Amino acid sequence: IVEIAHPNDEYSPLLLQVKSLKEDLQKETISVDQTVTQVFRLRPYQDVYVNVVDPKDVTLDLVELTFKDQYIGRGDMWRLKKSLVSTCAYITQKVEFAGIRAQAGELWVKNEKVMCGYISEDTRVVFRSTSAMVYIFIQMSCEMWDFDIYGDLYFEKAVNGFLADLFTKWKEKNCSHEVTVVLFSRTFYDAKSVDEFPEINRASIRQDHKGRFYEDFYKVVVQNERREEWTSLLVTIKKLFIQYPVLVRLEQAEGFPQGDNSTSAQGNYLEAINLSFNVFDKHYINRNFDRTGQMSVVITPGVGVFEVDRLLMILTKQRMIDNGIGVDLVCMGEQPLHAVPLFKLHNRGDDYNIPHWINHSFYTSKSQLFCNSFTPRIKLAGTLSAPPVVPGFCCTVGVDWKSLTTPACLPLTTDYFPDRQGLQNDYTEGCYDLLPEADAQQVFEEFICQRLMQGYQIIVQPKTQKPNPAVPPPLSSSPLYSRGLVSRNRPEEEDQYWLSMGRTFHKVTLKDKMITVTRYLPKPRADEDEWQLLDGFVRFVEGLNRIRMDSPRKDGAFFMEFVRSPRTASLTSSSTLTEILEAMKHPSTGVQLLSEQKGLSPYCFISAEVVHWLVNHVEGIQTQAMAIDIMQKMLEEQLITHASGEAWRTFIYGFYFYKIVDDFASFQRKWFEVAFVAEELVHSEIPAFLLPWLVPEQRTVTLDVDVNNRTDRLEWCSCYYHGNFSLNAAFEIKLHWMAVTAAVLFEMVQGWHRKATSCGFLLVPVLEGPFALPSYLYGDPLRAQLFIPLNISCETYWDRMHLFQEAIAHRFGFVQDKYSASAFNFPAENKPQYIHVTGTVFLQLPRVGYNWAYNTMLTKTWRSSATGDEKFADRLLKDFTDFCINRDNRLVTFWTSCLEK
Amino acid sequence: MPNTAMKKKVLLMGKSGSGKTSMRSIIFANYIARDTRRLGATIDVEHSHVRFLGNLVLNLWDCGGQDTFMENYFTSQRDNIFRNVEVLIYVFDVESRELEKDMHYYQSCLEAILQNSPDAKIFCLVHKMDLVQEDQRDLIFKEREEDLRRLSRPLECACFRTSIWDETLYKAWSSIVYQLIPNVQQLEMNLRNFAQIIEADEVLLFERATFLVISHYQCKEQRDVHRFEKISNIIKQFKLSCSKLAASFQSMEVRNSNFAAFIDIFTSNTYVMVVMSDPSIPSAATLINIRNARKHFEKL
């Protein structure tokens, strides 16, 4: 606990570190060479008599920690703060814990930044990312095409100035995000045309009757794609700005059109933020392991006024109660003479409201003049009333770049009043004694009992985008639609909840419920382990705290023999009913057996090796009959009642025992993720990339995710096979976890990825969102489901046509790009769904043609020379639409090549 | 103490409204009859483990009572819920009117526990008799006795009466525990030896953390049934009062005109009280006989 400082003469910064009770200075240390070139250049040899030995209780009241390239749920942030109670720090240290890593930054005491210092239990740490997931909603109106002072279009100010500055700062601070850039706007009087009916909406006012037809358009630009070297989006946004007025005016319904309505009179603003929340509520569906923070930024040329319905504003207050992610910035400039974020109510004195949940920021342009006016002008030809907006004073608002380049995660400790009485008339206590066991079965019992993951309380998710017509503007998405119904419910009338979850030894967790804030109180696995894990799982969702030669590994060995199975596919006489000679003198030769050591397996062996042995010595494919005949004497598994195991092509993981535990109800918000195994052949994967140019059906395993010597945390997660055949088709592995730190599971996945590529074939994480509409349990509100028609021009049409469709698909197989029927796991199996081998492309088979979508989960890692380089995907689009709409004579020559057999 | 850590299973079911989870919450969380007004609605299933004098641990299931939850019990996952059941408790409201649906659920529950438990047992418990006059309390309890003895025909049931504002609750769950206990005869023999060689009026031994009447021996049979209930209620009221003082009890002494009662720790989770048939003795007898008792029970 001793603290050692060591400057030299008049070093204006200092340095200090820890040890345990240094007095006589016999012992010194070298641990770091970097800190010399990180602070000051000198070579201190053993005792120059400058090393001060002092207790010096000097704290560092707020310290910032930045993350990169990973995924960290907030329980792991709690574990880092629990491990960072009583230590030292300095600027740009790389703090690590259990494969988790952060870089220290901007450490302050109350006015000033310190080079070094000490952290003890009462200073506060705040987590930020440079690897966040960020949406950019550009709101367009008729004020984009309007000039301002200094001489500009507001569009040109916004895009050119602000986006050039933001992308230069994104290059300078060396961050790597995942963006959307979505344009959105409204039009009026687009009533009806030929079958454009569920796209419109109709606005009205109660107190003075006013009802009009209107219509909302979203045009997306790049959807889910990280790349360095930006500013190409600036060129595409200029192209879409010039193409935009015809693109919005002359579409689906043509009455007299009024485009791009004013923001200070109407707007789809609050609906746009609510649809960003409709994206972010389903974060647990397809989980990237390379992003942490969440961010939604709306760029508007508005003044700050919005004329907004009452129900949507109250509903988005209740939805930003959960996960605060919203940021607003105004590229109009001209900071007005009142409290600038404000809402005039539009309910079905002009009723004002001011938000304190939003983070607004203006963008002044770069010039210097005399008196910047705060007013526009346009010449026509010819009981309470307790918030007004005008007596609130407001000097200037900046841009707040630090909350736009490094997004801040949600805090850990907040102070609030206790759970007394009156309104919240409901408490419930569950005291759950825990029996330690050495056989994964203890957390989930308490978990499904005491909460059922907000089984008590509701999720207030009342906005459902049920419809979306899309438009055949190009190969990004383009949904242009109506929001659909809003099924709002009020909060829990006359009672909130609070809970008392006890460990009957000595421990209590007191849960409050208006936002999930906790109070933990103290008085095989240990007691504190299960207690800490349960506090982490209450922490994950809403987590405020009150305060004051076989290497026989059970996946690697079977994965390696399924690698051996292609290259071996692609003794005396038989007919003796004694069977003792062959089936007992297998070990006389060099037959490899799992018999040296492994748990629950004295003398074991794999079926495929034995059947390849019996085809290497006896006849071809009648070996399973004699294998059953010897299985009637010598077995493999526990309670057999079977054939010769499975004779061929069937995966089994480890845990030999499964026959003679709480499951996962899908209400509990499982974090799941579908990795995928795709049989591949490089001989066409290279030239189309290059200059050339034209037994059940699921299986559960509950495995332990650790290759270390930890002895601190037991760590389990559930694999589901879809495959128990793996003929030469697709294969997929689902991972369901409500459990331990994701980064260890990420290095397990990447470990058998390295075992997949070297000596084998591709394992790729694959978006298990099929071609799903919005308001499905999978999917986004921003997916196109692109269409590609088969212009043919040449008893049971559909079945033979489906087989011919498989033939065209596997013809793209043979020449460039193999296919696989990715037989997914919904019962009755509605649509046929093909994955392409070694690429980024989904197809389904429903006009006459068949539809297409673009995988967004590769993201430049899990990357080899087989796949990659998105130009490949666009080339396959071009080649496939050429081959599909009957270019030169390709389909007709394919007809002749089929008919000549 | 030989720690044969078994794991017993007990369900608590019945109709919603009156006193489903309230009685469990006042018998295993140190509440009062007034503060149980704040529990409110439960959900489908919630359960708990409670440890109890060491070795025995109860999986205590509390089942809800809405229409969809009982239907999702019977015509659904039933085989998981009614498997390996030892003790069933079935709650009866007095004031409730829909008796037909109550006995309909009761018939279906009896047939389901018959087809999923051969040697379990059912205790039905008519609670909340604090609203009816005492002569009508006698009439209603005897009618429930006879009617439930008829409708519980192929397998027997035990029907008790209770309320929350009295001590018959403590008697009824004392009966549940004394049926559910593993061992009887060795503790009875040590009880009888202790009481007949240290000549007491009556000796009483209890669990510590909830104080249910485990065992007793007397030689003055002039208190009818309500001595155990009353003394358990009043000293657990005193323990609830001392709970707000950050202090444990573990020891007390009282003597009177013809009366000499003493309470102390015996073992890791057991209380003893005793009245000793000789009121004019100071604590030397209590000293030598807590010595005389802890030489034997700490060989047990």
Ligand SMILES: Nc1nc2c(ncn2[C@@H]2O[C@H](COP(=O)(O)OP(=O)(O)NP(=O)(O)O)[C@@H](O)[C@H]2O)c(=O)[nH]1
């Ligand atoms: N005064 C009084 N109140 C009682 C008595 N019995 C039950 N209550 C009241 O009945 C209320 C309901 O508690 P309880 O029935 O345990 O709740 P529950 O049925 O498990 N909730 P759910 O309907 O979701 O299953 C309690 O608040 C309690 O005050 C009684 O004998 N006297």
